[PDB]
């Protein structure tokens, strides 16, 4: 019901973001100008607000501060720095919060031809370009067997040294970055995802997807959910050992 | 008589076999993954490629990552890695690809990188440019970026662990602190993104000819440069740094 609406919002967001991603000039000789991404961000937000005004009068809308009632939170493009360079790891993130708790989430990555979604009590799913498949986190129980995806080293000299130690301990390390690390945890394809500095707009949809897939997502101090300023997602089995190594 | 057309047809056949094997995987896992089904798929694709090239190019040598072969540094030599990214393949991560190249006189002249679970293919031929297609839409011609300052550059690598062996770990981490953006898309994908101009630097400290030959012609035809860490041009140097060409000498200098 809210999930069906969230998936329809993602359909509309994808139509707008696809066109703007395709229209970019990717020739570049310096740091990229984020103006076309900001422009796309504004167009998606406007469309989302217009639809929710029609279909959910009296739901609040937050676009990338007080959490009350039913509130939709949208990050039209997560991975803006990828979007602007022509790297297709970017997605719209759409969540419904009830009293600040993600209850519906959609992660829509049109240039990866992929979507992930979840709703409380109804499981998590992914599609590639194409029937949905139900998601489940892995059963990897030992850190030395685990696969980890992060974003970069620079955001982490104590916590940096500890993070690098975790990367030396696990079986496999990659940095697919942003939302994609967390979505791969939910699919069971990766075991650990971590980012040291990340906002509620970037975590809300991922929180419900990971939880419905059987995993855990907490801040670095182990507090559940998307509000803690940092995010560690695991299959749940590895969670305590990861927080211990990082703390 | 078109070697590029044959290479793209080998990729079509490889993709039909790898799609089936990727789709059939048991993804339940509770330890390090059992590579056996991936090793089997890897070997089956190589065998099929060898059988086709035996039929369509009977004098040509074929050097494969799974069955080996002699190298000729002078004749025509096909070099294939049927599945690059097998540790992704086995876990259900779709970053994996068949890499197919022809060398003439030691130099990659045709290359195809085929990633069916990313719905993507990259290819190039000497003098004829580099191209990519996404979900079999029309090809687009590739061009590396024009980023000239390291501090504005985007870098993609694989992992940190392989850097200690040549003694470069501290230097590599220093490069990651210098550039504008760091990711690790890993394997062939870092280099393909350099060719598209979406990333500026790709680096790996240990890479075989099978893993570099197709990437070498794609990067070159896109306007970039791919060398070993010690500056040897091409896929035979044992390590690989690919850039947009502008950043090349500064990257090699920072890494040593
Ligand atoms: Zn964001
Ligand atoms: Zn982000
Ligand atoms: Zn292989
Ligand atoms: Zn390989």
Curated annotation (Swiss-Prot), chain A:
Q: Does the keyword Transmembrane apply?
A: no
Q: Which PROSITE patterns match?
A: IMP_1 (PS00629)
Q: Where does substrate bind?
A: 64, 77-80, 174, 202
Q: Name one GO biological process term.
A: L-histidine biosynthetic process
Entry's Gene Ontology molecular function annotations:
histidinol-phosphatase activity; inositol monophosphate 1-phosphatase activity; metal ion binding; phosphoric ester hydrolase activity
Q: Cellular component terms, GO, for this chain's entry?
A: cytosol; plasma membrane
Pfam family, any one: Inositol_P
What induces it, per record? When comparing gene expression levels of the four IMPase family genes in exponential cultures of M.tuberculosis, the level of cysQ is the highest, almost equal to sigA; impA and impC are expressed at approximately 40% of this level, while suhB is lowest, at 12% of the cysQ level.
Q: What class of enzyme is it?
A: hydrolase
| Catalytic reactions on record | L-histidinol phosphate + H2O = L-histidinol + phosphate
Q: Which cofactor does it need?
A: Mg(2+)
| Residues binding Mg(2+) 1 | 64, 75, 77
Pathway this chain belongs to: Amino-acid biosynthesis; L-histidine biosynthesis; L-histidine from 5-phospho-alpha-D-ribose 1-diphosphate: step 8/9
Extent of the signal sequence: none
Keyword Hydrolase assigned: yes
Q: What residues bind Mg(2+) 2, as annotated?
A: 75, 78, 202
What is the consequence of disrupting this locus? Strains lacking this gene appear to be not viable, even in the presence of high levels of exogenous inositol.
Keyword list, A-Z: Amino-acid biosynthesis, Histidine biosynthesis, Hydrolase, Magnesium, Metal-binding
| Family from the record | Belongs to the inositol monophosphatase superfamily.
* Protein role: Catalyzes the dephosphorylation of histidinol-phosphate to histidinol, the direct precursor of histidine.
> What protein is this chain from?
Histidinol-phosphatase
